[PDB]
Amino acid sequence: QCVNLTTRTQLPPAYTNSFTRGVYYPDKVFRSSVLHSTQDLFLPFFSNVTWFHVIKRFDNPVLPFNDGVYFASIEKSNIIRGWIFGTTLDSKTQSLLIVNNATNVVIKVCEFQFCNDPFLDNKSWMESEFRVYSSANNCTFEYVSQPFLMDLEGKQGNFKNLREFVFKNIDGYFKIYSKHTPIIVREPEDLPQGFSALEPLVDLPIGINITRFQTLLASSSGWTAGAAAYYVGYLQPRTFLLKYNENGTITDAVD
Amino acid sequence: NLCPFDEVFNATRFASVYAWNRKRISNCVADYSVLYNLAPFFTFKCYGVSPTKLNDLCFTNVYADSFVIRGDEVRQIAPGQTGNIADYNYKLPDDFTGCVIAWNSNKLDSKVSGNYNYLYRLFRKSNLKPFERDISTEIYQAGNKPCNGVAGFNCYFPLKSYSFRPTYGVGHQPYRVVVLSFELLHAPATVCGPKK
Amino acid sequence: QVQLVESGGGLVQPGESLRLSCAASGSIFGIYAVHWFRMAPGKEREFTAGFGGSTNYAASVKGRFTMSRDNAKNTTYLQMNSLKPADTAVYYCHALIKNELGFLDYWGPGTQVTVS
Numbered sequence: 001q002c003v004n005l006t007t008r009t010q011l012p013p014a015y016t017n018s019f020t021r022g023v024y025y026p027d028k029v030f031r032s033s034v035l036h037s038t039q040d041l042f043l044p045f046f047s048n049v050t051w052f053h054v055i056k057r058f059d060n061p062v063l064p065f066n067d068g069v070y071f072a073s074i075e076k077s078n079i080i081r082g083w084i085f086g087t088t089l090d091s092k093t094q095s096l097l098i099v100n101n102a103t104n105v106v107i108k109v110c111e112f113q114f115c116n117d118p119f120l121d122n123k124s125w126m127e128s129e130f131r132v133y134s135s136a137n138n139c140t141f142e143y144v145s146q147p148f149l150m151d152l153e154g155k156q157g158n159f160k161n162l163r164e165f166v167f168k169n170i171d172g173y174f175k176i177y178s179k180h181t182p183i184i185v186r187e188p189e190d191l192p193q194g195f196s197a198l199e200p201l202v203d204l205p206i207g208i209n210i211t212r213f214q215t216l217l218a219s220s221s222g223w224t225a226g227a228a229a230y231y232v233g234y235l236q237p238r239t240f241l242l243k244y245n246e247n248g249t250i251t252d253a254v255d
Numbered sequence: 256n257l258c259p260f261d262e263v264f265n266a267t268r269f270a271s272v273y274a275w276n277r278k279r280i281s282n283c284v285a286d287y288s289v290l291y292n293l294a295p296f297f298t299f300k301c302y303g304v305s306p307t308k309l310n311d312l313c314f315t316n317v318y319a320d321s322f323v324i325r326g327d328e329v330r331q332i333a334p335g336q337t338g339n340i341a342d343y344n345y346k347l348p349d350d351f352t353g354c355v356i357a358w359n360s361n362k363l364d365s366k367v368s369g370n371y372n373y374l375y376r377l378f379r380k381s382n383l384k385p386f387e388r389d390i391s392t393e394i395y396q397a398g399n400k401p402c403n404g405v406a407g408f409n410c411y412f413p414l415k416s417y418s419f420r421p422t423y424g425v426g427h428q429p430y431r432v433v434v435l436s437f438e439l440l441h442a443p444a445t446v447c448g449p450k451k
Numbered sequence: 452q453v454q455l456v457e458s459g460g461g462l463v464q465p466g467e468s469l470r471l472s473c474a475a476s477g478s479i480f481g482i483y484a485v486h487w488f489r490m491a492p493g494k495e496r497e498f499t500a501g502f503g504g505s506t507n508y509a510a511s512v513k514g515r516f517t518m519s520r521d522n523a524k525n526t527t528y529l530q531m532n533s534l535k536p537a538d539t540a541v542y543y544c545h546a547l548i549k550n551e552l553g554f555l556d557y558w559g560p561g562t563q564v565t566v567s
């Protein structure tokens with residue numbers, strides 16, 4: 001149940017090059033201090049990724065999905081809550097909703113009728129329109145977990161918390177790798193250079209066709225929020241060489 | 256992890272056969288030892304695999320159907336079996352792969368006035384397909400003479416009600432029955448018990 | 452589970468109307484197949500009135516059994532206009548209503564009516 005939000009003033013998006021991002025653990029097998037080569041789905045260096053900055057002005061159009069997407073976002077208040085996935089999303093194709101609220105995480109595999117502009121948000125946060133869908137007829141899978149180290153509420157200022165996601169579906173099972181990058185005090189423009197090696201979260205034994213997707217942000221209108229910045233890029237299969245350490249974590253990777 | 260078989264096997268009441276209570280169980284761990292060692296179980300015969308090695312076999316789907324019938328017609332559970340309850344209430348196809356358990360609940364399903372809370376469909380013009388529930392209860396007509404409104408000749412309700420009382424002995428035992436199906440599916444196997 | 456209770460049972464002279472209804476208390480997911488029944492001291496189970504969007508009643512009493520369906524309070528009403536001395540029987544309401552379980556089939560305790 002949502003009125004047509006409108007209040008949309010779209011502008012051309014930005015593109016920033018990928019310096020060092022797009023690295024994840026290939027598998028849950030323990031090694032130590034060795035050079036090993038891999039050939040898998042990866043992120044090219046210095047390629048453009050779409051930058052969206054939101055400060056009124058709102059930026060969340062439809063986002064096509066194809067063979068995994070690398071996402072990043074830099075913030076204090078964790079304005080983003082959840083994501084949606086599917087193919088048509090109109091009470092005919094299986095839909096996946098994910099969101100980690102204040103207390104826990106909810107993963108929903110069911111059939112739905114969302115709003116034209118689904119939302120969960122006026123600087124003070126309200127949980128209004130949390131139930132963006134209107135129908136929950138054919139629900140199959142459910143799961144609950146602890147919230148992904150979200151900061152609750154938040155005051156506008158610097159952006160310390162950098163969160164990056166590599167959502168992918170292969171062999172039905174969906175895999176999520178991520179890491180929390182805090183205390184980035186430096187003024188954010190373009191992207192920082194960092195050697196992250198995103199670590200596993202869940203390996204849901206589900207699977208559907210996903211062609212596009214969207215995320216969720218946080219008086220149906222008149223909402224007021226501070227600045228925020230996030231980043232989206234596609235993935236392609238390539239190869240790399242990785243060096244472990246004596247502990248067994250990657251120190252460097254090269255193309 | 257434990258699959259929620261307890262509430263199914265320890266349910267307070269079992270629904271009618273025409274409203275056969277069936278549940279899909281998925282995404283858990285189902286150990287068969289406790290159910291196998293459950294002493295008051297009387298008959299437990301399975302049709303697809305050996306009934307003592309289900310734990311190492313992992314299946315994606317679990318279907319459980321629970322109900323109460325007479326002790327006389329328990330052998331009507333077999334797939335393709337004849338009988339009014341099979342024809343008008345619930346039928347088992349001959350290709351069904353699964354298990355079936357039956358036991359006694361005569362001490363709780365006996366009414367001094369006669370247990371008439373259980374009902375069963377008795378008339379149906381088109382035999383129900385396997386694994387189907389039919390709820391329509393219009394005034395059935397058989398002969399070419401049109402039937403509408405009141406009951407009577409060629410106008411009989413398609414349902415009948417059981418008669419169970421404690422004075423009844425052999426042949427009128429109210430028996431609890433559960434039927435388990437694990438028909439293989441393209442979905443990956445999820446439900447199965449621990450392996451020692 | 453959801454308990455069914457009967458209200459309106461009382462001593463009624465032959466010739467006037469009786470209003471008998473079955474209220475449901477508990478976790479009710481909505482009203483479903485409900486059938487009203489009678490049994491005299493000496494006769495066996497028979498179907499008296501109910502449904503079959505199609506509503507059925509007994510013989511020669513079609514215009515006397517009038518129900519009123521109310522979903523806001525998840526309970527209906529039944530009215531027996533112009534009762535007869537041959538209708539001395541205990542009415543049982545059986546409802547297959549949806550609960551936490553897929554459905555529940557329960558028989559109302561019923562109220563005795565003595566018409567003579």
Ligand SMILES: *[C@@H]1O[C@H](CO)[C@@H](O[C@@H]2O[C@H](CO)[C@@H](O[C@@H]3O[C@H](CO[C@H]4O[C@H](CO)[C@@H](O)[C@H](O)[C@@H]4O)[C@@H](O)[C@H](O[C@H]4O[C@H](CO)[C@@H](O)[C@H](O)[C@@H]4O)[C@@H]3O)[C@H](O)[C@H]2NC(C)=O)[C@H](O)[C@H]1NC(C)=O
Nearest residue numbers: 099100101102103104105106107127143144145478550551
């Ligand atoms: C952030 O998100 C989490 C979930 O990811 C929310 O936490 C859950 O909140 C719901 C209610 O909002 C809680 O539901 C309540 O507890 C029971 C849940 O059902 C379970 O019951 C047993 C386990 O006890 C199992 O069969 C199975 O696991 C079920 O999932 C129920 O008692 C209630 O839910 C249902 O009750 C009846 C049952 O028929 C229905 O009629 C109701 O309509 C309802 O659907 C009850 O509502 C749930 O327990 C919470 N889980 C956890 C882990 O906390 C947070 O609330 C949310 N934070 C917010 C919104 O701020």
Ligand SMILES: *[C@@H]1O[C@H](CO)[C@@H](O[C@@H]2O[C@H](CO)[C@@H](O[C@@H]3O[C@H](CO)[C@@H](O)[C@H](O)[C@@H]3O)[C@H](O)[C@H]2NC(C)=O)[C@H](O)[C@H]1NC(C)=O
Nearest residue numbers: 031032033034195197243244245246247248249250251252
């Ligand atoms: C493998 O992991 C260990 C543990 O994370 C790494 O040890 C880290 O570095 C040195 C030893 O190599 C140590 O640092 C010490 O930190 C304390 C404060 O905690 C400080 O007081 C000491 O003076 C010293 O600097 C310590 O073991 C550890 N430091 C941490 C965890 O902060 C080790 O380097 C890793 N091996 C690699 C990366 O090859």
Ligand SMILES: *[C@@H]1O[C@H](CO)[C@@H](O)[C@H](O)[C@H]1NC(C)=O
Nearest residue numbers: 001002003004005115116117
């Ligand atoms: C929103 O607009 C779309 C298209 O203009 C329309 O189909 C829909 O019904 C509208 N919904 C509301 C709540 O106004």
Ligand SMILES: *[C@@H]1O[C@H](CO)[C@@H](O)[C@H](O)[C@H]1NC(C)=O
Nearest residue numbers: 013014015016017047048049
């Ligand atoms: C995107 O990449 C192309 C490389 O062909 C580059 O020319 C272009 O400048 C990039 N986009 C932006 C906004 O810089």
Ligand SMILES: *[C@@H]1O[C@H](CO)[C@@H](O)[C@H](O)[C@H]1NC(C)=O
Nearest residue numbers: 091092093111112135137138
């Ligand atoms: C749910 O599934 C049934 C049977 O497959 C279908 O009839 C119904 O339309 C579905 N509901 C949806 C997709 O919302």
Ligand SMILES: *[C@@H]1O[C@H](CO)[C@@H](O)[C@H](O)[C@H]1NC(C)=O
Nearest residue numbers: 087093094172207208209210
């Ligand atoms: C995905 O689309 C292909 C197109 O041929 C289809 O064969 C397949 O069944 C679809 N899978 C799902 C889960 O929708």
Ligand SMILES: *[C@@H]1O[C@H](CO)[C@@H](O)[C@H](O)[C@H]1NC(C)=O
Nearest residue numbers: 260261262264265289290293
């Ligand atoms: C049902 O309850 C009894 C009594 O505690 C218990 O022994 C039995 O294991 C229960 N059933 C199941 C399937 O656990």
